[PDB]
Amino acid sequence: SGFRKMAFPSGKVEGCMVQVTCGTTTLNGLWLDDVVYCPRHVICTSEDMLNPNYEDLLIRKSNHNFLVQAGNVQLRVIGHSMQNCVLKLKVDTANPKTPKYKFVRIQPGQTFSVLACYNGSPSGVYQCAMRPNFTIKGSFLNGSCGSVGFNIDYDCVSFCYMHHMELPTGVHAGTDLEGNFYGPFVDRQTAQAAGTDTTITVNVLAWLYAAVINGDRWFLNRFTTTLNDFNLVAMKYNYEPLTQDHVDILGPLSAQTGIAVLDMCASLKELLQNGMNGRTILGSALLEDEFTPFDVVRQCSGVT
Amino acid sequence: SGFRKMAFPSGKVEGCMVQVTCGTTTLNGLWLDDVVYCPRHVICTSEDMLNPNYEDLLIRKSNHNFLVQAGNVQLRVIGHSMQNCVLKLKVDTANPKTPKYKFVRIQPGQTFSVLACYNGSPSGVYQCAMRPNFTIKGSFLNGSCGSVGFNIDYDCVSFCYMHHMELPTGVHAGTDLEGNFYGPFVDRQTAQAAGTDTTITVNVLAWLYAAVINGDRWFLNRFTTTLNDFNLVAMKYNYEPLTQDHVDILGPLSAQTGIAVLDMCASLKELLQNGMNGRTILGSALLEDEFTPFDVVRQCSGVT
Numbered sequence: 001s002g003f004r005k006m007a008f009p010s011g012k013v014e015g016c017m018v019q020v021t022c023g024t025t026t027l028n029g030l031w032l033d034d035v036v037y038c039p040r041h042v043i044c045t046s047e048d049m050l051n052p053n054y055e056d057l058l059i060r061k062s063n064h065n066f067l068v069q070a071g072n073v074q075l076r077v078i079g080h081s082m083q084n085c086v087l088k089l090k091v092d093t094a095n096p097k098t099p100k101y102k103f104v105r106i107q108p109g110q111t112f113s114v115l116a117c118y119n120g121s122p123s124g125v126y127q128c129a130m131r132p133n134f135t136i137k138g139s140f141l142n143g144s145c146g147s148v149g150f151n152i153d154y155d156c157v158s159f160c161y162m163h164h165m166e167l168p169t170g171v172h173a174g175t176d177l178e179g180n181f182y183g184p185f186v187d188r189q190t191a192q193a194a195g196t197d198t199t200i201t202v203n204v205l206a207w208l209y210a211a212v213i214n215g216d217r218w219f220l221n222r223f224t225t226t227l228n229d230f231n232l233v234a235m236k237y238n239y240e241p242l243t244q245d246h247v248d249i250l251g252p253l254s255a256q257t258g259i260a261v262l263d264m265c266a267s268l269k270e271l272l273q274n275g276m277n278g279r280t281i282l283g284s285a286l287l288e289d290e291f292t293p294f295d296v297v298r299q300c301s302g303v304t
Numbered sequence: 305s306g307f308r309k310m311a312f313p314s315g316k317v318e319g320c321m322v323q324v325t326c327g328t329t330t331l332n333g334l335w336l337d338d339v340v341y342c343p344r345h346v347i348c349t350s351e352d353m354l355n356p357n358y359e360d361l362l363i364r365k366s367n368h369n370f371l372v373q374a375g376n377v378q379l380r381v382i383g384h385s386m387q388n389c390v391l392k393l394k395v396d397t398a399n400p401k402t403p404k405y406k407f408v409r410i411q412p413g414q415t416f417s418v419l420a421c422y423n424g425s426p427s428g429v430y431q432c433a434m435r436p437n438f439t440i441k442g443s444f445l446n447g448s449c450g451s452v453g454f455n456i457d458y459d460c461v462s463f464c465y466m467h468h469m470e471l472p473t474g475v476h477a478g479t480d481l482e483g484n485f486y487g488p489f490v491d492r493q494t495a496q497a498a499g500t501d502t503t504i505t506v507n508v509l510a511w512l513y514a515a516v517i518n519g520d521r522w523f524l525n526r527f528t529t530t531l532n533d534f535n536l537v538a539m540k541y542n543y544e545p546l547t548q549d550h551v552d553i554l555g556p557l558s559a560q561t562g563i564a565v566l567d568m569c570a571s572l573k574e575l576l577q578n579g580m581n582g583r584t585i586l587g588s589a590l591l592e593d594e595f596t597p598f599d600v601v602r603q604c605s606g607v608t
């Protein structure tokens with residue numbers, strides 16, 4: 001037992017990280033087959049970022065202006081194209097370490113691992129969730145752009161995120177691997193404010209089930225509630241509305257613990273109204289919302 | 305910016321994970337060069353665990369009774385020996401993916417990454433700290449034994465921990481890579497209670513410096529304190545005593561932020577006495593103690 005914020009093993013993604021340099025700007029790229037994917041803002045100078053016209057800036061660039069380095073070896077660029085906010089650099093060598101992969105666009109509330117990189121080299125790995133305001137709360141310094149978010153299904157890596165920027169508020173924004181930003185964010189150095197960061201209710205419930213599976217049961221109460229009554233309390237506390245789909249998703253956790261989803265909702269309702277009273281749940285003094293029901297089942301079963 | 309509980313990239317350690325089976329027991333092994341390291345309790349039946357005599361149980365085992373599998377290929381065992389609580393299985397093939405490595409024995413308060421494995425396959429990676437009572441608060445299910453804790457210095461992996469067991473209290477115990485347990489624990493299914501789990505004070509301070517570097521400054525106060533006055537408060541709150549060595553270690557963080565260590569100690573003193581008052585620091589409602597000053601500097605500088 002024990003419950004930890006766990007990331008997927010990162011080896012498969014480490015084998016794909018490369019350094020992309022254009023002019024004086026250096027960031028990370030993801031090398032899959034004979035294509036290197038990187039944020040398009042690699043072609044900008046800090047002076048361009050204020051109001052960049054990427055199509056115009058790109059006309060000034062040729063295959064030889066994009067320097068791609070994997071380890072200490074230089075890859076030859078034989079083509080370049082812009083797809084939304086990402087650049088695809090066709091190289092002459094297929095990545096020999098290319099894992100089985102997919103490009104997916106995740107929904108808010110979904111979690112993923114981030115392999116934070118600098119100059120194409122891995123720095124660390126941590127677990128994130130796509131917030132309901134389409135930002136992530138990462139750990140990203142200057143040069144981390146191009147680091148990716150991913151999930152693993154046995155041996156297939158699903159790439160879901162590519163890091164592009166930090167907003168003035170310190171939160172992070174980026175795209176899926178087709179270059180489309182999550183949320184209303186643009187790759188421009190301009191006033192961009194995030195919307196309300198609500199709590200991912202279904203994930204809090206999944207984490208409450210993980211706590212009961214791990215022996216932390218103090219919060220379990222004698223009450224029950226309805227989806228409508230629960231959602232009235234949830235909206236008041238900036239919690240996402242809970243749907244019958246979320247109740248269904250929690251089904252296996254409800255089955256394993258013998259605690260009906262609506263009973264767990266009433267326990268959570270009392271936690272919101274009464275607070276934690278100086279107590280902890282799985283060593284946390286706040287309600288954790290960055291474990292999906294799938295992450296909870298996965299960790300408590302030992303999927304490899 | 306942003307501050308996350310970050311583990312080291314795990315690829316280098318994934319390339320070393322193997323499955324070791326003896327009789328009906330299957331656990332994980334670490335394959336470095338032509339040696340596979342695993343917990344010695346692999347030779348026990350659940351019935352033996354109550355009071356095992358490892359030297360006697362080992363006499364009944366031969367090289368061919370230890371089945372080592374790396375991926376889907378079987379390694380040939382040409383020798384076996386017991387070193388403290390670990391078995392070293394000499395195989396006929398050196399691990400081609402052996403990274404540069406060291407075996408280190410860490411001190412309490414030190415952090416490390418865990419690559420949780422099942423049947424020699426990686427399940428996930430998370431960040432731990434060796435508690436001052438020599439336990440770890442991991443996420444380990446049956447079969448996770450043999451999973452290792454490690455740190456990375458550029459390209460050299462320092463293996464510091466091998467998982468062996470869970471105590472009745474749900475906390476975890478294990479050895480360094482020479483088979484010596486951290487703490488007073490024995491690899492036996494017997495009543496083993498951990499001592500006081502105190503907070504790692506120097507790590508809390510390092511995390512308070514990480515918060516100031518990341519903009520969370522609400523807790524900074526107008527006061528200062530002395531090591532003796534601070535330690536009187538710290539002992540009352542089950543915090544580890546702070547030494548001049550810890551003040552020295554925090555030196556670079558103090559230099560970067562312009563906040564003297566003793567001023568940060570007075571801020572922490574007030575947090576202990578007055579509480580958080582419903583507030584958060586780096587999104588946490590409790591004081592985090594599982595980032596060393598080195599982890600803070602590393603994350604805030606982007607070491608790869």
Ligand SMILES: O=C(Nc1nncn1-c1ccccc1)[C@@H]1COc2ccc(Cl)cc21
Pocket residue numbers: 041049140141142143144145164165166167186187188189190305
């Ligand atoms: O945000 C950016 N990079 C970054 N990535 N993670 C954190 N930060 C960062 C670190 C420190 C301070 C500020 C930001 C770059 C710089 O300014 C822009 C403007 C637009 C874009 Cl698309 C990208 C960027």
Ligand SMILES: O=C(Nc1nncn1-c1ccccc1)[C@@H]1COc2ccc(Cl)cc21
Pocket residue numbers: 001345353444445446447448449468469470471490491492493494
């Ligand atoms: O603790 C053990 N394994 C394990 N590793 N992580 C968590 N657990 C675990 C999971 C569920 C329940 C209880 C334990 C084994 C089983 O019992 C013993 C007795 C002695 C030793 Cl040295 C090892 C073990």
